[PDB]
Specification:
The structure is cut from a larger assembly and holds one copy of chain A, one copy of chain B, two copies of chain C and one copy of chain D. Chain A contains 14 helices and twelve strands. Chain A is an alpha/beta fold. In chain A, β2 and β3 form a beta hairpin. The chains are: A alpha/beta, B mainly beta, C alpha/beta, D little secondary structure. Bound molecules: guanosine-5'-triphosphate, guanosine-5'-diphosphate (GDP) (2 copies) and magnesium ion. One guanosine-5'-diphosphate binds next to α1, α8 and α9 of chain E. Chain D: It comes from Bos taurus (Bovine). Chain D: This is Cilia and flagella associated protein 90.
Chain lengths: 440, 609, 427, 48, 427
């Protein structure tokens, strides 16, 4: 078992981390006080916590995480919440002034006031780690520090820690619905650092998650908490083999070389298959085929980009629970023989299957009914290029009139970087349409 | 399969610390004898058996109520030991409580019975807290620091929250129990610069001070309420090999033992002897018969004593082999004498009242063989050195020794009825034939066929040939008169016992395949093949002198009554826990006696004339 | 005398070798605690060939357990027969191979190769004459493929006259469990064709059919998918630890299965495989024993023997058998089926019975064939390499640890040159 | 934001703590400190 | 009737030496008080070598215990085996040798010499025919570096024909605990070359390494480090205290291992070192004691023995062993490693067997050798000297109790000549 810290930045990132660390401590057994009710002697010591927890001696297990947000409202609610003894006060770094939905005062002006304290605190976790695999950094592409401060982290963690698998769990803004007005700007100005020192940029937009909660999970009027519980179960298959045993154990370094074909192409999707509510959970049988089929379906995806109008290039399929290998490779066979699901010619192979032995633990009060055989898919398709293209249209419209710029340039940022992020996105879109032609 | 009767038991495993105990009803003793724990009655021959356990038990822990008795066994490293609770009133398993890997060193109960501390393992030492109510675990922590070593002792107090451990590396730590958070909190006791090695704990009756017995020969008294030392031991004239047993009285006194047997009653401030009496063997257990007037002392060379406090006069009530016992043989004619034969010792015993009359010790040496000459004038012995020592029946002097008899030990031995020839086996697989003159003990022939090792010699009723079981799968009927062979009986089992059926025409063979088989003395063919015991192998047999019953015991720790003509089974067992090595029909056909891998001499009332 | 230490490497190799050290341990008779409580002395006398010795009758496996991540070391030790392996042979690392062939060979395996070679160089000098080394691995993954073949080349230089046989798990046809599997297999047999004597090729999809269409097991696990390989691995070295009428050790197979020195990729097969319901409805006599092992269904390598010639032939029979039938049936396989046998070797039979059967089954065999249907296994890894090499794919995680694009052509040249040899003789 | 962790004291599932990742190679290979190998068996060395 | 006087000086010397008195009291059967309770009479037959007699048959060690502080004096006295020691042999100062070769040799160390040497005269003249003197002194620091070497010079002038053994903890380059340990070693070497017949150097770097990769201990403490040192110390004197098939006293492995008149810096090592975790999964035989000896791991003098050639090595064995396989393995290590031994000596290995082994095991051995690589243990301190002597660093302390810098230059020159003479006899 090895370790990985999780740097949550943004109001979004720490509220995703609120649902994540609730699930994390439940899987192992850590109570909100921070203590495990059974001791390491009793149990034939189970060091499954080590990937996300660290013992102090009195049984006080510790979240290997650093909550950061530059505005003090969403971080003080976890120093006053039920999980206030679990976290460490030095881990919960906060600031005074808002980023105010502005890239410039996330990276250049306000972000420099706390870039020293976080990089010291990453060092504190990294020193006591012995097998630190990856940085699981949670943020959203459509706000302040989640667009800002995370870019200054990505540059600093690469100079300091180098090759340590800088993963990135991220929240893209949606095609139609949006909770900001300046959102196109800070969503393409920060993707410089995303196509730079970050090796696997997982993608979720808020809009697709609402549709899953309505159709499959059968709740109308969903709030932001149910949207974050889905993200927590996404990690818990990505970090399941690092914490629990399985048939095909799959490491965090395994994920990259099994999903990134080219150094520029490093943007996967995420899909949880058996995500149904309890009343329609007596109803479906849910063996193995219907959930292998589920991730491969449009109205189960977690990003508003249809894989049918695109070609797959890499797809690791991670399974948990009571999954039998013959049931997988038959389900692999039956879905590799469907015309609408297209794989590019330079991937004759197909899928990376990962089998785990731990069924997903249900959050009490959560929506998701228990499933004894679950799937968390991490795809990689050319169809993500339409998700980059819809904000490209939206950015090009409100930049040609030079709107909402005097907030940006008058905060420590040069005008030239705006045009640099413009040409940078054209290059990545040209790369994705290039990597998906069939050479013949 | 009618049970015979189990009368009388000799045996005690004194090598465990804190062994022999007397429950507060003051009428029965409790002591461990293998992977079983006995209950011998005070003033009554009545004795019962606590079954269970796989390998040899290392711990006993009886309650202040007497209602609960616990124990703990050793196992192979990597495997999990089993702490077995019991009820003294009904003697039946009520918990298995398996957490500690490796083995156990010590158990202690809570004052009023609701927790058990069972510190276990030189490989996996970690103190745990049990529940006597839920039969389930509560707390858990490493029992020693990373700078210090490992702990082998536990004790409770007069309040059920304290639990105290010492060490062979100095981990004097007074813990405190914290049920709501389910954790324990240690506190190392400062003792100055006195790092010592200590192996025994006792506390006062009013929870004042706990008392230590170190290897240096020093009684360490320390405070559990200020976590500090109070008084060191004897300044001069310190004890011997370290104090291995301490038992604090209801007074301000303490019965301190030693590794030699110097049981001393001393007071607190000087720790100077008041009344000294020397015991044989290193003192491993000092119990109290409740009030403390009759304290029973157990020793590692297993001898249970009986000392009255007001005169310090002893009475040896139990005497045992302290090591593995092999070969029981009876003198010709009479059936009231044994030959209980073990490492470091050769003993004889009176059958009716178990009481030894001669002990023959050859230093740190092992005797795999014993035999009685027909004239009753020499106890022939086969020692691990390679020397055939022949001691005298009375006194115990060495009449003669045959130096360099066999190379790798002399294992199996047998005399002849003419009292002139001693047929000798060997661990190199050699059968030697010696001549016993009045002044010389020469060699006549060296018959060498067996490759591995010889296991059992048997001689017929009027001497012309002998059978020699061997560990390589061969049993040869050597011709004794013309110094040759006669047979090449062969099988795929490591033979461990062979016997001559009276009216000699066929021999019965045993071994590892549990395929008890009659074999003929002519043409050496298979006659029957009985199935021995379904569990392990068969070490030992004896056919009666009327040829109607042959008794059987083996690794299956269990005496088995088998009649001859039909292969039916009149099985009994429920005997002793420890691998039965040899067994012998009494000459008068009145008892059957088996030895075991742990020192234990069992007698059963032989049926079937 | 004759000695085989067992170099299990990788995740797959440690799992199969765990299953392998169980089927030896209930054949020679070993408890989880390494002690003998077996039955016969016709079972111990040659326990040397796989097991070392400690005090008190404590036979210890002669296996060097190596895997770059420390996770699979935990699974072997926590397994049922995991309390037997000596705790000095466990040579693990810190960072896993990532199923990256040079992450296993040139940059983290390079600091573990000098440590695992020391342990092999201790269990090789306690041998009067060591025959050779068996290395259980998988060509699909990383440290099994990359580090594993690094051990092969180093060993072949250190001990150059010993039987280097490898029990390999070569990629499956349709089932794919790694998208990095085409490159890992290609680089491995570039180092395996020249430095190994007997490459036994075990697929996965082939065994998937055997546990369904022959054995009828609805939900089979990897343990049952390694028991068939372990039964084969016991089968090869059977006239080497137990007595036989006509004996055959590893070299006697090797001299009789490799006509031409490059050509050594073989096909395992276990004959007596009965479904549980259909077990009482089948006589256990040698005519069905020879049929089933030559049948294309019980063929644990996904290369149909009807799609090619079948150069050299094994039947390492086990049990008390009459020698006429194993000369009659093997002749009947040849003469009647005079098409799927090469005309340029007169008689292709290496029948060799043992006396001691496997536990239970009173009859057995071990099918080891050098067919030229092997090329179908190495054409498919040659068409998906070239598809992935055409437009440079996953190579930024291949050249970063330090390699060249030159070695990919040299590795792929050794592929089609190997296939051309099996196509030269296919006619 | 308090909805994260209200029903935590009403567990719906008793946790199946069987398929874990309990470390055995780091805890059964490496001893703490005794140097037992060249030490005498000593007091209380009952063998199976 | 060949006795040894065991001197010990410094905190390190008093700690290792007290650990030595525990392992002799176990092999010779002495309880913590002092009474003989060993079983074998082969122990009481030579109780004179390291012990004396007193009233009531309480055997007392023949040791003089000296330190300039009563800090480790009270630790030895208040220990497990701390009452055996004579209560006047605890002869000590009170001031303190704050690390300085001056503060043991040219000041406060030099007033206690006239008292400790009276005890040495009293003990050496209670022997019938004393064999020699052994001293445990840390080469880096105060009492050991200084006063200990001062004691060596006085005893050598008084008793010139009796041998002088020194077990010395030379300062390691990586594990460092004092900053002036380069200064103390260079000044201590000069009075260890002309006044010592055998210098066993035992640095702390290898001792930590053996307790991590051989003994496999997570957290070694100072107690078990000296137990490895005490095992070697009770490996060279064993044929002075126990019978044997081929006996060898402390002079026989001096006449057969000191080639040239200075040439006497040796490297210790123990044969049967195993973890408790391994222990059972391993046999104890003569051809595996010799592998555990002739390597890097068990060489507690941390210095690569493959980067130099052994002049003369001996191996004093202890157990019930046969004289062929012992001599055969000593022959084999010379043939298969013919480049690791010099050629101008025909046989480089000396053999000794002592029947009675240490308590516990049934077999052991000791490995001391005159490797020419020991200059590497002496280059580093010279490098740590010249890069500390160039700018007169930390020297004003040294020239305060009376010491010219000319003594410093000649000590470095003598130690460089020590490296020279080992460098000449490479080939
Ligand atoms: N997944 C997820 N995304 C959220 C959540 N809440 C907000 N977001 C997304 O985050 C974006 C804005 O949040 P942040 O980036 O964290 O804004 P911020 O860090 O507070 O910026 P400043 O207040 O200026 O410092 C919105 O556009 C949402 O799309 C949430 O609970 N879960
Ligand atoms: N037969 C068998 N195959 C296995 C087993 N475990 C994994 N595999 C196969 O090995 C391939 C991947 O090998 P991998 O585990 O990555 O090897 P690694 O490089 O050591 O990690 C997959 O295609 C699996 O089918 C097993 O226990 N038995
Ligand atoms: N192996 C070992 N080394 C020790 C021990 N005690 C001290 N040392 C070493 O001795 C060195 C310091 O010696 P020092 O106490 O200054 O010698 P002194 O001034 O003569 O008393 C340190 O570098 C330690 O590594 C011990 O118990 N065992
Ligand atoms: Mg905010």
């Amino acid at each position: 078992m090895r370790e990985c810290i999780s740097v949550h930045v943004g109001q979004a990132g720490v509220q995703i981390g609120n649902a994540c660390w609730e699930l994390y401590c439940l899987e192992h057994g850590i109570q909100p006080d921070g203590q495990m009710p059974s001791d390491k002697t009793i149990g034939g010591g189970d060091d499954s916590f080590n990937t996300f927890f660290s013992e102090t001696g009195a049984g006080k297990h510790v979240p290997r995480a650093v909550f950061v947000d530059l505005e003090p409202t969403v971080i003080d609610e976890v120093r006053t919440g039920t999980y206030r003894q679990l976290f460490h006060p030095e881990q919960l770094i906060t600031g005074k002034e808002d980023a105010a939905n502005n890239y410039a005062r996330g990276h250049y002006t306000i972000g420099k006031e706390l870039i020293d304290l976080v990089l010291d605190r990453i060092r504190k976790l990294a020193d006591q780690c012995t097998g630190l695999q990856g940085f699981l950094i949670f943020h959203s592409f459509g706000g302040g520090t989640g667009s800002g401060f995370t870019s200054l982290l990505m540059e600093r963690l690469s100079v300091d820690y180098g090759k340590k698998s800088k993963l990135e769990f991220s929240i893209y803004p949606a095609p139609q619905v949006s909770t900001a007005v300046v959102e196109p700007y800070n969503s393409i100005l920060t993707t410089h650092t995303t196509l730079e020192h970050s090796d696997c940029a997982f993608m979720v937009d808020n809009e697709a998650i609402y549709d899953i909660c309505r159709r499959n999970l059968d709740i109308e009027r969903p709030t932001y908490t149910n949207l974050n519980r889905l993200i927590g179960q996404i990690v818990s298959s990505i970090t399941a083999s690092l914490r629990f045993d399985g048939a095909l154990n799959v490491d965090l370094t395994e994920f990259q070389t099994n999903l990134v074909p080219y150094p520029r192409i490093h943007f996967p999707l995420a899909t949880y298959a058996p995500v149904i509510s309890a009343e329609k959970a007596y109803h479906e049988q849910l063996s193995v085929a219907e959930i292998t089929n589920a991730c491969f379906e449009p109205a189960n995806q977690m990003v508003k980009c249809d894989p049918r109008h695109g070609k797959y290039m890499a797809c690791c399929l991670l399974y948990r629970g009571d999954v039998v290998p013959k049931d997988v490779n038959a389900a692999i066979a039956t879905i590799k023989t469907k015309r609408t699901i297209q794989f590019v010619d330079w991937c004759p192979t197909g899928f990376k299957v990962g089998i785990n032995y731990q069924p997903p633990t249900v959050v009490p009060g959560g929506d998701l009914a228990k499933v004894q055989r679950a799937v968390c898919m991490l795809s990689n398709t050319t169809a993500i290029a339409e998700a980059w293209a819809r904000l490209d249209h939206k950015f090009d419209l409100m930049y040609a009139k030079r709107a909402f710029v005097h907030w940006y340039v008058g905060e420590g940022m040069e005008e030239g970087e705006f045009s640099e992020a413009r040409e940078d996105m054209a290059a990545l879109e040209k790369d994705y349409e290039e990597v998906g032609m069939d050479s013949v | 399969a009618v049970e015979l009767e189990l009368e009388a038991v000799i045996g005690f495993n004194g090598h465990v610390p804190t062994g022999l105990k007397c429950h507060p009803d003051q009428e029965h003793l409790v002591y461990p004898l293998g992977c079983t724990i006995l209950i011998q009655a005070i003033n009554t021959q009545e004795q019962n058996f606590l079954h269970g356990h796989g390998n040899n038990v290392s711990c006993v822990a009886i309650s202040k109520s007497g209602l609960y008795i616990a124990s703990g066994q050793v196992t192979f490293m990597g495997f999990k030991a089993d702490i077995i609770l019991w009820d003294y009133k009904k003697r039946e398993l009520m918990a298995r409580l398996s957490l500690h890997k490796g083995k156990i060193e010590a158990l202690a109960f809570s004052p009023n019975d609701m927790y058990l501390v069972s510190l276990g393992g030189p490989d996996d030492g970690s103190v745990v807290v049990w529940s006597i109510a839920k039969r389930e675990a509560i707390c858990g922590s490493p029992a020693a620091g990373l700078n210090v070593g490992n702990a082998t002792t536990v004790i409770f107090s007069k309040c059920r929250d304290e639990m105290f451990v010492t060490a062979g590396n100095g981990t004097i730590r007074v813990w405190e129990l914290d049920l709501p958070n389910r954790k324990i909190w240690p506190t190392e006791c400062q003792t100055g610069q006195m790092k010592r090695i200590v192996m025994s704990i006792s506390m006062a009756n009013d929870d004042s001070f706990f008392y230590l017995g170190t290897t240096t020969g020093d009684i360490l008294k320390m405070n559990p309420r200020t976590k500090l030392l109070a008084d060191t031991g004897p300044a001069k004239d310190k004890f011997s090999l370290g104090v291995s047993a301490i038992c604090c009285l209801k007074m301000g006194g303490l019965l301190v033992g030693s590794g030699d047997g110097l049981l001393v009653f001393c007071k607190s401030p000087s720790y100077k002897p008041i009344k000294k009496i020397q015991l044989q063997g290193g003192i491993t257990s000092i119990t109290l018969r409740g009030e403390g007037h009759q304290f029973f002392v157990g020793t590692e060379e297993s001898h249970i004593y009986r000392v009255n406090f007001t005169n310090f006069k002893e009475t040896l009530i139990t005497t045992c082999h302290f090591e593995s016992v092999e070969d029981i043989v009876f003198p010709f004619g009479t059936a009231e004498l044994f030959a209980t034969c073990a490492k470091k010792d050769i003993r004889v015993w009176h059958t009716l009242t178990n009481r030894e009359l001669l002990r023959i010790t050859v230093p740190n040496m092992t005797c795999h063989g014993i035999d009685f000459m027909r004239d009753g004038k020499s106890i022939i012995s086969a020692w691990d050195d390679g020397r055939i020592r022949a001691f005298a029946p009375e006194t115990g002097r060495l009449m003669y020794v045959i130096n360099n008899a066999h190379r790798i030990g002399v294992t199996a031995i047998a005399t002849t009825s003419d009292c002139k020839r001693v047929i000798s086996g060997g661990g190199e697989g050699e059968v030697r034939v010696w001549h016993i003159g009045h002044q010389t003990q020469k060699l006549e022939e060296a018959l060498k066929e067996h490759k591995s090792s010889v296991s059992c010699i048997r001689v017929k009723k009027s001497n012309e040939e002998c059978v020699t079981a061997s560990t390589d799968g061969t049993c040869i009927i050597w011709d004794l008169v013309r110094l040759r062979r006669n047979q090449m009986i062969l099988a795929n089992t490591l033979f461990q016992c062979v016997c001559y059926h009276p009216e000699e025409f066929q021999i019965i063979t045993s071994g590892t395949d549990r395929k008890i088989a009659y074999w003929e003395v002519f043409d050496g063919s298979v006659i029957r093949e009985l199935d021995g015991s379904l569990s392990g192998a068969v070490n030992g047999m004896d056919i009666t002198v009327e040829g109607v019953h042959f008794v059987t015991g083996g690794n299956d720790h269990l005496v088995k009554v088998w009649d001859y003509n039909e292969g039916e089974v009149t099985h009994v067992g429920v005997g002793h826990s420890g691998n039965i090595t040899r067994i012998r029909i009494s000459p008068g056909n009145q008892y059957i006696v088996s030895v075991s891998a742990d020192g234990a001499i069992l007698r059963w009332k032989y049926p079937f004339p | 005398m004759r000695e085989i230490v067992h170099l299990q490497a990788g995740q797959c190799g440690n799992q199969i070798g765990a299953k392998f050290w169980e089927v030896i341990s209930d054949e020679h008779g070993i408890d989880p605690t390494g002690t003998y409580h077996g039955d016969s002395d016709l079972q111990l006398e040659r326990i040397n060939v796989y097991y070392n010795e400690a005090t008190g009758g404590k036979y210890v496996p002669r296996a060097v357990l190596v895997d770059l991540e420390p996770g699979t070391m935990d699974s072997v030790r926590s397994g049922p027969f995991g309390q037997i392996f000596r705790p000095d042979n466990f040579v693990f690392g810190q960072s896993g191979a990532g199923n990256n062939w040079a992450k296993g060979h040139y940059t983290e395996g390079a600091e573990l190769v000098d440590s695992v070679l020391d342990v092999v160089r201790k269990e090789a000098e306690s041998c009067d004459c060591l025959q050779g080394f068996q290395l259980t691995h998988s060509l699909g993954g990383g440290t099994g493929s990359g580090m594993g073949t690094l051990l092969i080349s180093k060993i072949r230089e250190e001990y150059p006259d010993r039987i280097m046989n490898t029990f390999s798990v070569v990629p499956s046809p349709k089932v794919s469990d790694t998208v990095v599997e085409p490159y890992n297999a290609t680089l491995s047999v570039h180092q395996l064709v020249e430095n190994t004597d007997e490459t036994y090729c075990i697929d996965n999809e082939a065994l998937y059919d055997i546990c369904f269409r022959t054995l009828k097991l609805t939900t089979p696990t990897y343990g049952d998918l390694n028991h068939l390989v372990s039964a084969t691995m016991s089968g090869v070295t059977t006239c080497l630890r137990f007595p036989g009428q006509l004996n055959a050790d590893l070299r006697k197979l090797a001299v009789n299965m490799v006509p031409f020195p490059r050509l050594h990729f073989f096909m395992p097969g276990f004959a007596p495989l009965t479904s549980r319901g259909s077990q009482q409805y089948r006589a256990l006599t040698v005519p069905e024993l020879t049929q089933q092992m030559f049948d294309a269904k019980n063929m644990m390598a996904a290369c149909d023997p009807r799609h090619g010639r079948y150069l050299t032939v094994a039947a390492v029979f086990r049990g008390r058998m009459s020698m006429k039938e194993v000369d009659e049936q093997m002749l009947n396989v040849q003469n009647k089926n005079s098409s799927y046998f090469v005309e340029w070797i007169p008689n292709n039979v290496k029948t060799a019975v043992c006396d001691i059967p496997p536990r239970g089954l009173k009859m057995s065999a071990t099918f080891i064939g050098n067919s030229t249907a092997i090329q179908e296994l190495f054409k498919r890894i040659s068409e998906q390499f070239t598809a992935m090499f055409r437009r440079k794919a996953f190579l930024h995680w291949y050249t970063g640890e330090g390699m060249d694009e030159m070695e990919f052509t040299e590795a792929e040249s050794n592929m089609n040159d190997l296939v051309s040899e099996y196509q030269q003789y296919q006619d | 934001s308090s909805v994260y962790g209200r029903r935590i004291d009403q567990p719906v599932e008793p946790l199946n703590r069987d398929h874990g990742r309990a470390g055995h190679v780091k805890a059964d290979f490496y001893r703490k400190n005794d140097i037992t190998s060249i030490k005498a068996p000593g007091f209380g060395h009952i063998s199976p």
